[PDB]
Assembly symmetry: D3
């Protein structure tokens, strides 16, 4: 019901702008797949390293799950900024 026109900052977008935005989102989905793969790798690494207290300590000290989460958040906020550069909402 044209909900977007009810939200402050709405701007009419061309097809080229919509296509660029969807390009961002589809490259983002490839990053989501990569991040899932890394997370699976981390889980297998943690598993295979069970009862290797030195290697469990190494993994805990490198904090890879935390770094993967930081990376996911940066990728997602970067996508939002790029999409904002295309959409150009009039609002602050």
């Amino acid at each position: 019901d044209n909900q977007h026109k009810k939200i402050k900052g709405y701007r009419d977008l061309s097809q080229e702008e919509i296509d660029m935005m969807n390009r961002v989102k589809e490259l983002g989905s490839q990053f989501e797949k990569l991040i899932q793969d890394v997370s699976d790798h981390l889980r297998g690494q943690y598993n295979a390293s069970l009862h290797n207290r030195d290697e469990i300590t190494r993994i805990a000290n490198a904090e890879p799950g935390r770094w993967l989460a930081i990376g996911k958040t940066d990728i997602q906020t970067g996508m939002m900024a790029i999409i904002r550069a295309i959409a150009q909402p009039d609002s602050f």
Copy 2:
């Protein structure tokens, strides 16, 4: 000359870790291409809008070049965090 072994935090990487890291970097290159395309679009948009003072003001108020730069920086730091989740340097 094994320069990396001279840097604190070095860890020996498997081929699978190296391949995951290179995957991150190659998806990142696709984002670099996308960002270049958006930047070209912004330049053409600024050009075609010359002597449309209302539209030059609109563009200045949306600050799209700034948002594209914020997005590039987030994409790049996200790539670094994901690569760190794979590499797992022992150092803080």
Copy 3:
């Protein structure tokens, strides 16, 4: 022309969600006004301090224009995250 339905991640929003989003944007406009006021203050401070080389050096060393810009960027990305928490796009 229902442009939003053409963008991946679209979700139908209730009036309450739209109102919460607009609330975010209107509080954000109050922050934009505050930031403008601080920027005006910084310009007057720089002016009144002209030919006070110790105070021009103090201002340059505190880098207040840079800190105001960092704050504006954090306020704006925070608004985007809050709006995303309301809108809940299905996409990564």
Copy 4:
């Protein structure tokens, strides 16, 4: 007991600077109220959606609690940067 003078970077502030800082903090309190309201909305949304496995999955996939937390953190660090632009501590 003038504790602040014991902290490196102290600068004497005018009443106008103190008032601008307090303005930042009071606008921030309005954002805190907004964030509380959004969080309450998210909790009610999760409740009303109980035993709607498709909608519980949708909510889990949008990660709204995480996005609200990211937004709160950006709002708070933005406030700190703006206040730093006013206070202008001499320290790095």
Copy 5:
């Protein structure tokens, strides 16, 4: 086995670059020690304040563990950016 040469973006580093990078990492270790000390202080503060419901509420409202974690993450990503300024990988 020259693993780094297998990673896209490799550049040959001089001894001065390696030394600057290690300097960053060693200053970072001093920050890690400081952060550990602050965390110990927070734990003792929480302990000594047990059954002081007003002070437990004060601590919960200031969220110091969260702020310490935000600071650790900023210190670590800052170290990565500085090291990147020295290393200068050719890759995006």
Copy 6:
């Protein structure tokens, strides 16, 4: 004139809290010195590479000045978060 008591969020600090805060600031000054040294190195690198168009292009493509600035900003906001974990202002 007890200016800090006029700012919302004031809390009375112990000597141990003030000392921890000053420790943060003094480690930060060591990072400021390191960043200055890296910046000097970058300037000498740019100089010695004058009229080596391939190496000027390499430097421009690595964007080391930008990465050093990102690192400085992360170090400084990390210091602010750590200090906030010690100071514990009552305010949002």
